[PDB]
Design a protein around this ligand. Structure first.
Ligand SMILES: *[B]([O])([O])[C]([C]C1=[C]C(C([O])=O)=[C][C]=[C]1)[N]C(=O)[C]([N])C1=[C][C]=[C][C]=[C]1
Length: 263
């Protein structure tokens, strides 16, 4: 809708930085609205959805199990790991790790899950396979959030991320069971409160994954819709702003409010 774009361009002004936006009809896959759809942005923690998609794909092929318990040590822990830091003794199941990575944005959980599939380059390989030759992961947490301008490492394009997230949720890449498992994890997101969710009205469905990183990097990917069902895919990225977290959260929220208003 034209008015949402008005707010996207106004978010750019407010943040003094590029904003990438795209809106996909879930059913048809048709682009409803876009802005900088084919420019690169750092993925940040939003890649953790693609990662767990990669893990579920392996489970589908009988190469991994949700119940497999993984043990790790102090030395594996990095910053922001509010779940994996509690289970040094008991370890965690693959399922628990993917939960923590997606619902809590747990960095170590993500690293642990990257180790299971053979690292950043295997996730990028997994991506090339399903037909996304743009989204790339090159580093581990937390180095991937660096967000150096013009640096293409650890970046995606809104239109690629959106299209890729649509394939993972509604495509054949994953079994019905894994598709549902992935969506439920995104639906139980615990840390994205001040983004799209803060504009989301009661009764609406949302499954999302947020991201934060450096140099004002902030993002979110979501499947959402009215009446308790997702009906569109939304991707919002920004990088380069010197604004505070709160200011950046608000601009995203406000894009979300406009998105909802002109649904
Ligand atoms: B991620 O964005 O790759 C990671 C962890 C993180 C995620 C989120 C979110 O909304 O998903 C919010 C905050 C942190 N980012 C970092 O580890 C990054 N170094 C960082 C950490 C704290 C604050 C800003 C950036």
């Amino acid at each position: 809708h034209p008015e949402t774009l008005v707010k996207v361009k106004d978010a750019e002004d407010q943040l003094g930085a590029r904003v990438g936006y795209i809106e996909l009809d879930l059913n048809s896959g048709k682009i409803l609205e876009s802005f900088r759809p084919e420019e690169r942005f750092p993925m940040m923690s939003t890649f953790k959805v693609l990662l767990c998609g990669a893990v579920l794909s392996r489970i589908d092929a009988g190469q991994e199990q949700l119940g497999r318990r993984i043990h790790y040590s102090q030395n594996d822990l990095v910053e922001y790991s509010p779940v994996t830091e509690k289970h040094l003794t008991d370890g965690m199941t693959v399922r628990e790790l993917c939960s923590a990575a997606i619902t809590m944005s747990d960095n170590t959980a993500a690293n642990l899950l990257l180790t299971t599939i053979g690292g950043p380059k295997e996730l990028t390989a997994f991506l090339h396979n399903m037909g996304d030759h743009v989204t790339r992961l090159d580093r581990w947490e937390p180095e991937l959030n660096e967000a150096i301008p013009n640096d293409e490492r650890d970046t995606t394009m809104p239109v690629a991320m959106a299209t890729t997230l649509r394939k993972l949720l509604t495509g054949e890449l994953l079994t019905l069971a894994s598709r549902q498992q992935l969506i439920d994890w995104m639906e139980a997101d615990k840390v994205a409160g001040p983004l799209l969710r803060s504009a989301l009205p009661a009764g609406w469905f949302i499954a999302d994954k947020s991201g934060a990183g450096e140099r004002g990097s902030r993002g979110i990917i979501a499947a959402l819709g009215p009446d308790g069902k997702p009906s569109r895919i939304v991707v919002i990225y920004t990088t380069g702003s010197q604004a505070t977290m709160d200011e950046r959260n608000r601009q995203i929220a406000e894009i979300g409010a406009s998105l909802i208003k002109h649904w």
